[PDB]
Design a protein around this ligand. Sequence first.
Ligand SMILES: N[C@@H](CC(=O)O)C(=O)O
Ligand SMILES: N[C@@H](CC(=O)O)C(=O)O
Ligand SMILES: [Zn+2]
Ligand SMILES: [Zn+2]
Ligand SMILES: [Zn+2]
Ligand SMILES: [Zn+2]
Ligand SMILES: [Zn+2]
Ligand SMILES: [Zn+2]
Lengths: 261, 261
Amino acid sequence: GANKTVVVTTILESPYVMMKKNHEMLEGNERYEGYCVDLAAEIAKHCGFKYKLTIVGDGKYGARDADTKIWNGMVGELVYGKADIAIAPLTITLVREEVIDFSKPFMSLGISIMIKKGTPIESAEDLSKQTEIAYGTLDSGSTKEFFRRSKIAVFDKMWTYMRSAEPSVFVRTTAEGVARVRKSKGKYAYLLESTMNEYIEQRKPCDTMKVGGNLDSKGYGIATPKGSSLGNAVNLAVLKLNEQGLLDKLKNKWWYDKGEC
Amino acid sequence: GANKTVVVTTILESPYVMMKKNHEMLEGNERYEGYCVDLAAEIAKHCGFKYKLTIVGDGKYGARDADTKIWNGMVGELVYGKADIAIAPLTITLVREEVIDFSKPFMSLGISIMIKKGTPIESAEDLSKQTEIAYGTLDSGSTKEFFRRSKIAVFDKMWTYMRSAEPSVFVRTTAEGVARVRKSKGKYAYLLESTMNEYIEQRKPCDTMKVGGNLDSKGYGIATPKGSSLGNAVNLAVLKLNEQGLLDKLKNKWWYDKGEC
Ligand SMILES: N[C@@H](CC(=O)O)C(=O)O
Ligand SMILES: N[C@@H](CC(=O)O)C(=O)O
Ligand SMILES: [Zn+2]
Ligand SMILES: [Zn+2]
Ligand SMILES: [Zn+2]
Ligand SMILES: [Zn+2]
Ligand SMILES: [Zn+2]
Ligand SMILES: [Zn+2]
């Protein structure tokens, strides 16, 4: 049938999608800036579609409730037909690939440790062998699921602590986790994807850092509903953008050219 | 129909697939060892197939001849029906994804510079601004195509030199490129994937090293003929193996546990 405007679901996560200063009271795609905003414009150009950027209503990446079996987050928006594509830092995982389609990855990353500068922690193993410094992850995402599912001794030990810690060590958004590190006087460390860790390390007040290697290796992909005819073109477009060096240009633009430290 | 033994095409490239010592005169899959041999056994177990490992007849990864338009290498074995799957360090690229299917990546890598220790080169830009030290890549692969196609000033400059250099700066196999670095007294540098560079750096005689950052970011995938029904299960299997930490275990086993330096 006739061309239709593609509904894009995404999430407010710096530096992927951010509200431009003084654009809050305005309308349309032009309100937003970031790596994924630029990436959306390129995918749409190469695939030949018009699009509307929307922020996921529940502010979540996507997980399946064990009770209701209902998917939430951006994943849920695709699964239930509320959006046509997700262009966001959405991690490719087995349980998600069973219900939605993903392009080849547009960025690599791994889970990493964020600390307030001077915290006496260098590794996951260090966190796991002590009790003075609390630590946690984002809720409703792949990082939490990594720990929940791990059979690796250090990570299993970490999960056993995290799952029963009071008050909750989990946070609703990256920003909350970062604020909690900064206000903790060193007594909270945040487990998050290396991409966001590395970005925050380059922002004022320049009081956090990434420590240790990554805990795993994975990627973000552009997601479409299962069997969507958009998937083929989107996938080829990601591969073209990588080979043209466009994805590398965008990474430098939004991480390191914007550096404040 | 009835189950059939899956023909696996792969390539003799250390430490992915290697002939075991004293197994040359023997028969069957047990002759070979390496990261991809172990990976094949896991994919086959998770997908539920029996398989026969075969080494690609022409010893190439795969490129399309501009004249005949015929694909060679492992890609050609899939395209023309000679094999059912490729389990090898086969780089996911746009031109390949147009003719074969790839799983999500099982390993990340980038093009990198190998030098003989003491060579006064720290970067691609350094190579491009001088003439005393020759440099080249493997033929019939993604590294060569990267330079051929690049619009980035430094890489375009490098291609312009490489394509007309005499004697040829290209080599037939990784081993030839490595031997050429070692025998060059510093006057040849080899451009190759970071995975192989990092492996060689840990082997006797411990006279080479990787210098500088990677030139790009990409991945290896398991490849199947376009539209193959094996593709779905293979893809889910790669994602499972990554999440179980199996791929990381295999990397350490074949790179760093085997380290001789
Ligand atoms: N990017 C992740 C968020 C996280 O859990 O760190 C996701 O897709 O769930
Ligand atoms: N792994 C590469 C080989 C190379 O060109 O470095 C390929 O698939 O072509
Ligand atoms: Zn504006
Ligand atoms: Zn473009
Ligand atoms: Zn447990
Ligand atoms: Zn044996
Ligand atoms: Zn397994
Ligand atoms: Zn040129």
